Subunit: 445 residues, 3 copies
């Protein structure tokens, strides 16, 4: 809906609210088959140029098959094993006798079909390429006589086009040990992906979500290689199921908060930690510390709970009262006052320290705001760029309302002499405990 | 010019000087257009193989267009938004009525043309592919009658070649949400890029710089997707403008500096921080902490100020006097004495501790130097490899002069009992303050 | 052989044993040549469509050559220079007069041949593509008369197929500054790679190792561009030599170990550091801290000593007695008790703290184990998934024996009041020294 922001002058942090999250909680697996032709090499008296072209492209087909075979003889472990049991379980059933034969029978007359496998799983199977019909109908009469028949030039071109997708799939499955992500258009065309979404047990509102964000769905999908057996190449595509929909989400931005004394060696700094994406999830908050685990489109966020930490909902109270006893808000300390800026969703935090020249400009008016020393913020309303030293950042021109929440910077409530200035993973109450221990050591002395 | 190095035995660090830097300070945007053909699907009585091949490749063209359309209906946010306002501003003008019509008129007779847009911007527009002329002249008489005309086999091949670039551009813009970097040869051929450089408002010496380093220019460029409207596919290429040229640059190398006592638990360590690239920039120093933000060719360095910190020029004094009061030189402390090596531009720093077997060899002479415990350095003059434990590093055979600056290791000026051994972001004066506080706690006790 | 595991309840860590390692200790270089045709552009009266197609593909060949030339005029430095001297040394010899002429003579009649170069190096050279013979025999009579001869349509297609590999090689060498890794099938086909392995000075058991793990070999190989000179395009492929074979290897898994008091602010935490792969190597242990430097297939591990640290073999004693004086086992401390899990090779460590809902389920039985607060472990025998908060991890279904080594968690031997709770790189004896210093400051007070 309406994206809003709140800059907290006291902690040098901003919160971008109003995003609707879609969290991955399940997987929907589907079998993608390619019917191949078991045609060991055949040699006939051949010289005409069309026959040579056919045997060359046919040799590229034979090698793609032996290569997928050496990929499946020994399958190297991947860093994705913790996210693919759903699909590996389908591949293990397919290796059973008769299971590849069932899908070969269901897709005998149609391209798409639901097939009830062993393990009681009603999976949706599909056949995106048919090389067995093409090689056996158009090519075998051409290489399985005493002397080769002459194929027309249209067949030579059509076979290079059809065989291409097999080769590109073989290239991707080979360089990535059978597990590819994102799922490319070679693994699944956009036309095949949307029809696959349409044939899923999800709400009509959920099909609209995935169909309008196909690139994000591709980036949160996996393609797993199964088996080459009985003239069938099968591989599993693991598509995301978003069990959490339209959940409130926000993004925390933090920047160093130092004191602005003029004598070096007398300044202390604090920075809030755990910046990133937060989403309400099942009575708790799902936090995403890595930056690439959440894709954003407009007001919408797509996260994977695979790379999240589960925190109590009281973690949001670091945003309204950082000194609040229900949650131990985390900070880091240092004496490292280098100027920097963070481009938020609707503005910019600027931490200006020392002699750094910090400013905010409009493209036609020029410099419209000069930051003094400390931590400050400017909205995107009327601002295009922000300069810190020799670096120019661009402000997001997204529509929304910014709110500047005035307050005394909390770094000023701390005595420099007893401050712990090198904590790398501390907490507000931890630092206070270090101050009580440094104050007991001076009373005693 | 002449690359030189200075190893500082006192701080276990080396500085590689003599590089000439080219820092990105601006962007030069250009519009790249592809004229497409609005030919909704047309069906005629067709069976001949050439007609089938044409309709298949034509179907691949129709899907590439609907896919670029679903990419532009909802454009996902990227981590590059802080670096692309220059190009997003051109796309927003193109969405105005009449603006795509202007560039369609300027490139009616020629491929390249400067076009004055709204917003007073004289951008250089180009038309690298013409599918509207080819489909409407060679293909439409073939599918827009009662029965399809038979196209010759040369047309079938020429259309698969021309249509290919559209498909590869669609693949890259789709998997990357409309923003690609580096800019591939599909987005812009080397022939098109060099002619685009030649037609820029830069010095003759600056065109020679970018033309001789096209791969680095590609790696520091962005390709942004604009709009598909009125049979025109437009996308913006953002090329770097190096406002800083031939500026002095240097690279700092640091390695842990420990004491070499024989009893474990009695050794302390120090390591200089902020290793990376430094360049003189507008009265200050631009520091690049990330390693991949600066590309090196010979004596030349290409950095992006987007990922830099602006530091006072006194930061260079950590290299000549680390105990110097004008700048608080930063260090890290530990008791972690593991042997390691750093390959510098003209030699190697070796931090040898414990029982580790450290050496420097020549390919035909063998081991020519055995390092004892502590931090040392060897030039590339006569040295090919350096071995630390079970690891063999290769020495850069670049020509230059190395200078070994002798001095007492500063770790020896510190008493172990009161040393702070676990600081992760400290400073020379900070550590001295921790020593004064630990010395007041023992006087008191 | 048999993969086994040991979970140590006292330190919240697990060790996966039984892997056989293959460590890279050497390089085997090979020259890959492509004979090109020096045919500056030639123009004849041309209009027929086959001639146009030939000149278009020929123009793509001419540009691929000028592009490889601008790549070799100025070669940008790469982060791989410390691992490629073996191949750069072959390129420097090839630039000598007569050296490219020798390999051009040895591969005049055959595709593969061993060639003794200057520098006494008996390298294996190969010629994977012949464009000089094809252009000069099939194309030059077509563009080097007064008017162009008409080539048959088979030649037009065969030239687009042959020229393709040159263009794909030019694309990869251009975007990566002459050094590519992994080595793609365009640089070296699987058929060419296996024949290259077969012709190497290695044991019959070592050829079987590399031939059965070609994708891992590709990922641990480099392709380096040499020179374009006298109608010859040469580039060096650096293949790994595994000097260490069948060496014992193990993987250490660590998870935070906190106390489980009910009052926040009274809990302390410890986590073992240096998680990753360890292999016995030449009387010491080769440790691999980065996760991507070791590829695993079944019981087998493939590491590169380029990114390893050499540690004494006593480092294994942190696994049986962490309080052991022969090695100072490393830990990190905090007060950061967030629940998490680590999927091991044969089970899962679960660090459950606070109100987090931690469990282990079987697909058909449901929740079979509920973890209480502290650090615990569950084997893969009967367990499919493990849930921590809102995150579901998948358990590896690999066969092996797990051993739960019971013991009191060592975090309970520490008094909270004097514990150092913010160390980021500490050691067991270091922390004890901080406790002795905090105990002297309270006796004194
Ligand atoms: C520090 O001492 C004050 C004084 O009584 C007390 O109120 C506060 O709770 C103490 N802080 C901690 C973190 O124990
Ligand atoms: C530590 O004490 C000495 C003794 O007077 C003083 O000279 C020095 O400046 C002090 N160091 C710091 C960092 O305050
Ligand atoms: C701390 O003091 C005890 C008491 O004598 C001693 O045994 C121990 O070795 C000391 N620890 C360190 C790390 O010096």
């Amino acid at each position: 809906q309406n994206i809003t922001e709140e800059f907290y002058q006291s902690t040098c942090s901003a919160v971008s609210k109003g995003y609707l999250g879609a969290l991955r909680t399940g997987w929907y697996t589907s079998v993608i088959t390619i019917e191949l032709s078991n045609i060991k090499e055949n040699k006939c008296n051949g010289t005409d140029a069309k026959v040579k072209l056919i045997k060359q492209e046919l040799d590229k087909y034979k090698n793609a098959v032996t290569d997928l075979q050496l990929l499946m003889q020994s399958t190297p472990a991947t860093g994705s094993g913790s996210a693919i049991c759903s699909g590996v379980a389908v591949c293990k059933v397919l290796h059973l006798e008769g299971e590849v034969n069932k899908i070969k029978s269901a897709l005998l007359s149609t391209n798409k079909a639901v097939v009830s496998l062993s393990n009681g799983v009603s999976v949706l199977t599909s056949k995106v390429l048919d090389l067995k019909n093409y090689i056996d109908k158009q090519l075998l009469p051409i290489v399985n006589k005493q002397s080769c028949s002459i194929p027309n030039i249209e067949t030579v071109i059509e076979f290079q086009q059809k065989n291409n997708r097999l080769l590109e799939i073989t290239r991707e499955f080979s360089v990535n040990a059978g597990v590819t992500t994102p799922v490319s258009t070679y693994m699944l065309t956009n036309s095949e992906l949307l029809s696959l979404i349409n044939d899923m047990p999800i709400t009509n509102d959920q099909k609209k979500l995935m169909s309008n964000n196909v690139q994000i769905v591709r980036q949160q999908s996996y393609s797993i290689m199964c088996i080459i057996k009985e003239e069938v190449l099968a591989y599993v595509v693991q598509l995301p199921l978003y069990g959490v929909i339209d959940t409130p989400c926000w993004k925390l931005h933090t920047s160093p908060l130092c004191t602005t004394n003029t004598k070096e060696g007398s300044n202390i700094c604090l920075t809030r930690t755990d910046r990133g994406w937060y989403c309400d999830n099942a009575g708790s908050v799902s936090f995403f510390p890595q930056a690439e685990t959440c894709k954003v489109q407009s007001n919408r966020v797509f996260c994977d709970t695979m790379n999240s930490l589960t925190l109590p909902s009281e973690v949001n109270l670091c945003n309204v009262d950082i000194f609040n006893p229900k949650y131990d808000c985390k900070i880091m300390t240092s004496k490292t006052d280098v100027s920097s800026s963070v481009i938020t969703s609707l503005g910019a935090i600027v931490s200006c320290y020392g002699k750094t020249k910090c400013t905010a400009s409009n493209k036609n008016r020029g410099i419209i705001k000069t930051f003094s020393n400390g931590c400050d913020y400017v909205s995107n309303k009327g601002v295009d760029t922000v300069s810190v030293g020799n670096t120019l950042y661009c402000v997001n021109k997204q529509e929304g309302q910014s709110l500047y929440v005035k307050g005394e910077p909390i770094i000023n409530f701390y005595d420099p002499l007893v401050f712990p200035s090198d904590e790398f993973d501390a907490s507000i109450s931890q630092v206070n405990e270090k101050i009580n221990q440094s104050l007991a050591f001076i009373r005693k002395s």
